[PDB]
Structure 1
Amino acid sequence: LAAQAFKLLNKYRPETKQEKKERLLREATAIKEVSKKPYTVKYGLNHVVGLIENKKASLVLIANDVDPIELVVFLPALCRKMGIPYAIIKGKARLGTLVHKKTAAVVAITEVRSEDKNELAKLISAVKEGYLEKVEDTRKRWGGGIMGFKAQKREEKRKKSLETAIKV
Structure 2
Amino acid sequence: NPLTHSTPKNFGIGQAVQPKRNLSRYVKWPEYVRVQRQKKILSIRLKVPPTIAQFQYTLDRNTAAETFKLFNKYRPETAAEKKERLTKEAAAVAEGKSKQDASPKPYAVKYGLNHVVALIENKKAKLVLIANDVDPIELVVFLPALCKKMGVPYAIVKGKARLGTLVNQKTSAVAALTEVRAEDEAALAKLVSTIDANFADKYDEVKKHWGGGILGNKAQAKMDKRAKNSDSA
TM-score range relative to shorter protein: 0.7 to 0.9
Q: When the two structures are superposed, what TM-score results if normalisation uses the length of structure 1?
A: 0.83
Question: Which range is displaced more, 24-33 or 80-89?
Answer: 24-33
Query: 2:181 aligns to what?
Result: 113
1:14 aligns to 2:67 (yes or no): no
Q: Aligned to 1:77, which of 145, 149, 169?
A: 145
Gaps of 5+ in 2: 1-62, 96-100, 225-233
Q: CA deviation at 1:135?
A: 5.8
Q: CA deviation at 1:136?
A: 5.0
1:129 aligns to 2:191 (yes or no): no
Q: Aligned to 1:41, which of 106, 109, 124?
A: 109
> In the alignment, is the contact (CA less than 8 A) between 2:112 and 2:172 conserved in 1?
yes
SS of the residue aligned with 1:137? helix
Q: CA deviation at 1:132?
A: 4.0
Distance change >3 Å, CA 2–CA 139, structure 1 → 2: farther
Q: When the two structures are superposed, what TM-score results if normalisation uses the length of structure 2?
A: 0.61
Q: CA deviation at 1:137?
A: 2.7
Question: Which range is displaced more, 140-149 or 88-97?
Answer: 140-149
Structure 1 distance, partners of 2:198, 2:142, is 22
* Per-residue Cα deviation, 1:98-152 (whole angstroms, up to 9, x for no partner): 0111100101110101011211111111211355445653453111022133234
Structure 2 distance, partners of 1:132, 1:148, is 32
* Per-residue Cα deviation, 1:47-67 (whole angstroms, up to 9, x for no partner): 000000111100001100111
Q: CA deviation at 1:40?
A: 1.4
Query: 1:165 aligns to what?
Result: none
Question: Which range is displaced more, 144-153 or 128-137?
Answer: 128-137
Query: 1:161 aligns to what?
Result: none
Query: 2:40 aligns to what?
Result: none
Alignment length (residue pairs):
156
Query: 1:24 aligns to what?
Result: 86
Question: Which range is displaced more, 25-34 or 52-61?
Answer: 25-34
Structure 1 distance, partners of 2:178, 2:92, is 31
Query: 2:210 aligns to what?
Result: 142
Structure 2 distance, partners of 1:152, 1:115, is 53
SS of the residue aligned with 1:60? strand
Question: Which range is displaced more, 111-120 or 143-152?
Answer: 143-152
Q: CA RMSD in A?
A: 2.2
Structure 2 distance, partners of 1:92, 1:22, is 29
Gaps of 5+ in 1: 157-168
Structure 2 distance, partners of 1:149, 1:32, is 73
* Per-residue Cα deviation, 1:14-46 (whole angstroms, up to 9, x for no partner): 001111111112223444464432221111000
Structure 2 distance, partners of 1:24, 1:15, is 12
Identity of aligned residues (%): 69
